[PDB]
Design a binder for this molecule. Structure first.
Ligand SMILES: NC(=O)c1ccc[n+]([C@@H]2O[C@H](COP(=O)([O-])OP(=O)(O)OC[C@H]3O[C@@H](n4cnc5c(N)ncnc54)[C@H](O)[C@@H]3O)[C@@H](O)[C@H]2O)c1
Ligand SMILES: NC(=O)c1ccc[n+]([C@@H]2O[C@H](COP(=O)([O-])OP(=O)(O)OC[C@H]3O[C@@H](n4cnc5c(N)ncnc54)[C@H](O)[C@@H]3O)[C@@H](O)[C@H]2O)c1
Ligand code: NA
Ligand code: NA
Lengths: 493, 493
């Protein structure tokens, strides 16, 4: 429970390439907003294709066979990720404040949850660096066979705005541990935190060009990376629609390797025998956590028929109770949406729900006068055909669904292009074990929600993604396997 | 070595869909050519889009929750794969003959190598079915976390003509072991053997819809699969060219998962201290194996200056020695190319080589005047910038190169958009060890070539592929990871 720095010095507002700060070729900039006040915080360098080209050559050089970064011990790569984490913890109050400033999330979140997960991912993967093993293989014939786990190479990385430092860690930590080099494009919203961190990557002792950071727009800077002919791998976190473009740009350019971490319409499923007050609290937090701007948010609450009215009333009361206000004041649970578009976009979805036949139970309008705050909104009587039931709202709007049968709710939960996450609330063993098989999602929770750490693999089924991030499974994306098969004189077991 | 069946009965020439032989919806057929004579062996059904929809419907139903395929034991999936190995070994002669008839490969190859690799690959992945383990994870908090290794779902599988039975087995064996269903598109040049196999899949007792076979054209039948909106994964083996289209098609459809096994221009590299006779014999077979129609063929023989003349002379002699002729004769080493289009494409490359100032050393024209035979061809004094140095010939054309230093040959070997395979020939330990780190290839041989068994992962660096086939690493493509995270009352080590 420390004290936030209410308005700090922001020395870093340029591109980070080859371990030095410099402007865009064109010298352009663009504004970043504070969503609570609505006012422009400051200007940041606007990257484009020429700037990317620079970063890729820097990255490519740091990955040259013989390079400091390539020659170095895998354990030294770990120690660097560990130093980096020491530094993040030293500047924790600055970083958690700068995150709240630029993104709008509560400072209790930023500090306690976000920055903690940033420290642990760098520390977790640090440990993985010298533990990632290839195989020796007792193959047929007079042969000694083994696999090498080499890095994939220059890894392009594109992240969204909703967890700016977390999402950065999810990308950098594993790529660096497996020995790769990185050209990262951060969101156009929320660019400031990631630049301060880049300073600590330099201070930690990472060689020039191993990490390069680029502020700028998606259609320009981002698509330059996804289309570059000398980028070995792209890793994209963002919307399902842009995901489709990224995989096309890979196939259109150089057949670079692709991981996609995309959207969700993740169901929260509450059975009869569930702990009532525990389900209402978790399903509430499932949705409204990070103001609904969370990829796997519980944006479709399905509740068993016999407990629906009780569940409804409590869920609304929890939303009415939810403290909306300035995120720097500790005890604020809900900050503002991240920018003007998202604010208007969510408000449009609220209107749309009403127009289709859903009952607005509470909130459903702007909170206050300044900034991009919205009153916690809950809908009832919601049907599967409705647009709010099908589309990723990405804001503080909780639609409630009724169901009768177990076989019914699994069909309805899965009936979507999404498949990032899901959950069951139940006291029953057998029913818990059925839902873990039946639900088409990459992460299934039982009697909890939004539990994701550096150990837990995370990614989507179907149009929610390709591949997985975090855990041991998250290293595979940043690994290119070489098979080495050597003729030998005689072979013995 | 047994007698071949010269005039086998060919009962199977239709689509295989839901364990039923059926004509295409259009009733259209198309002919397959014996490349040894040039005559039409017979007609097979010309599948198109409407026929792929029907196949994918069947594969989807077979994959439903509660279907026989899904709730079967993993060890029964193994026994099915083993039973099929037995049936293949029962009909080994028939199948190796039908392969020769349709592909043109020597009957010695078809029986002793191809059909042995097919039996071994089905028996190998039979073993993996019930040994493919997920994780239990010591995760932060009051949680029990584990991973399930689920099948990825409906897998679209597209294969080339050069090793029909083997390419099918590399696809079906791991896919089935991990519990997927399959829609397979086999090459138009060689549709017959793959259909007789489907007859044994039925006889082995696989459920209906689990394996489906479509004969038909690439831009029609193959594109129908790759673009299909209910196919979960596409595994494509073919040209780099078509590879770009498959990865684009995925991004353009439903974000299906993509493994690509693509072309090569793999270098064999001979050092001064190598066993000459052996290095000559191996580099010779590296290229001329399967009439040069091999993805990872040693199609750039690099040789150290001090042994070059002696190497050249011996290589040329070997080329002139290689018995060309009818593949059904036991001592034939080189059959015809697969069809007229491939036959002419290679003679184009032979002409093109000499136009660029490459020295022709032997062969260089048709062999005889019936079927699609070409003379073992070898090219002296070849330079990096020539089209025959850069492009995949896919025929019995062995260009020789010359080098002085190691750092030189590593540069020159790696300077290509390909990276499927490579080899080095040397007696020295440090050198062998250096080349295994330096060469940018998914497979690196030492004092041998074309050693690929079920045990050994196989796939490309750069534009030669995305992901890996065979070995344990071969199972990852056919696996969708689900993370389960359960709230527990308390957590102890
Ligand atoms: N699964 C996960 O790990 C995860 C985590 C957080 C958010 N998300 C998802 O991300 C979305 C929210 O972020 P968003 O709206 O800013 O997504 P977005 O697709 O609009 O942009 C994300 C990033 O990609 C860039 N980009 C945009 N268009 C591009 C293009 N044509 N080519 C290359 N790059 C481009 C942006 O500049 C930004 O850096 C939601 O749909 C959410 O569910 C997923
Ligand atoms: N790396 C490996 O595992 C491996 C093994 C053997 C062969 N190969 C490669 O395969 C190639 C030779 O086979 P090929 O000549 O039939 O190549 P190809 O690209 O023309 O076609 C391969 C398969 O895809 C189909 N196809 C063609 N165009 C298509 C399209 N637009 N959409 C969907 N499917 C399409 C064909 O019908 C065929 O079944 C060579 O490049 C060789 O190196 C690779
Ligand atoms: Na902002
Ligand atoms: Na044929």
């Amino acid at each position: 429970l420390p004290s936030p720095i209410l308005n700090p010095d922001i020395p870093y507002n340029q591109l980070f390439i080859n371990n030095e700060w410099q402007d865009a070729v064109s010298k352009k900039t663009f504004p970043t907003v504070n969503p609570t006040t609505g006012e422009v915080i400051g200007h940041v360098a606007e990257g484009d294709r020429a700037d990317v080209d620079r970063a890729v050559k820097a990255a490519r050089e740091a990955f040259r066979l013989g390079s400091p970064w390539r020659r170095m011990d895998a354990s030294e790569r770990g120690r660097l990720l560990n130093r980096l984490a020491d530094l993040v913890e030293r500047d924790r109050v600055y970083l958690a404040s700068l995150e709240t400033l630029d993104n709008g999330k509560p400072f209790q979140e930023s500090y306690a949850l976000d920055l903690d997960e940033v420290i642990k991912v760098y520390r977790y993967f640090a440990g993985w660096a010298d533990k990632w093993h290839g195989k020796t293989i007792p193959m047929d014939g007079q042969h000694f066979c083994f696999t090498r786990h080499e890095p994939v190479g220059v890894c392009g990385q594109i992240i969204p705005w909703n967890f700016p430092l977390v999402m950065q860690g999810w990308k950098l930590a594993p790529a660096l541990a497996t020995g790769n080099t990185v050209v990262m494009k951060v969101a156009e919203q929320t660019p400031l935190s990631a630049l301060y961190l880049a300073s600590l990557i330099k201070e930690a002792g990472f060689p020039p060009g191993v990490v390069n950071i680029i502020t700028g727009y998606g259609p320009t800077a981002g698509a330059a990376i996804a289309q570059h002919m000398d980028v070995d791998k792209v890793a994209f976190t963002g919307s399902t629609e842009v995901g489709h473009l990224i995989q096309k740009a890979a196939g259109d350019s150089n057949l670079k390797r692709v991981t996609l971490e995309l959207g969700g319409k993740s169901p929260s499923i509450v059975l009869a025998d569930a702990d009532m007050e525990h389900a209402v609290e978790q399903c509430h937090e499932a949705l409204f956590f990070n103001m609904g701007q969370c990829c796997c948010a519980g944006s479709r609450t399905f509740v068993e028929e016999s407990i629906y009215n009780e569940f409804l009333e409590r869920t609304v009361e929890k939303a009415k109770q939810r403290k909306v206000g300035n995120p720097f004041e500790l005890d604020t649970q809900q900050g503002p949406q991240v920018d003007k578009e998202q604010f208007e976009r969510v408000l449009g979805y609220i209107q749309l729900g009403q127009k289709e036949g859903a009952k607005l139970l509470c909130g459903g309008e702007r909170f206050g006068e300044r900034g991009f705050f919205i009153k916690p909104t809950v809908f009832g009587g919601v049907q599967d055909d409705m647009r709010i039931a099908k589309e990723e709202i990405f804001g503080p709007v909780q639609p409630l669904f009724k169901f009768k049968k177990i076989e019914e709710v699994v069909e309805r939960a899965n009936n979507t292009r999404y498949g990032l996450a899901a959950a069951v609330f139940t006291r029953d063993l057998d029913k818990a074990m059925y839902f873990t098989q039946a639900l088409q999602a990459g992460t299934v929770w039982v009697n909890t929600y939004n539990i994701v750490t550096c150990h837990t693999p995370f990614g989507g089924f179907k149009e929610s993604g390709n591949g997985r991030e975090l855990g041991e499974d998250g290293l595979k994306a940043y690994t290119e396997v070489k098979t080495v098969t050597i003729k030998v004189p005689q072979k013995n077991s």
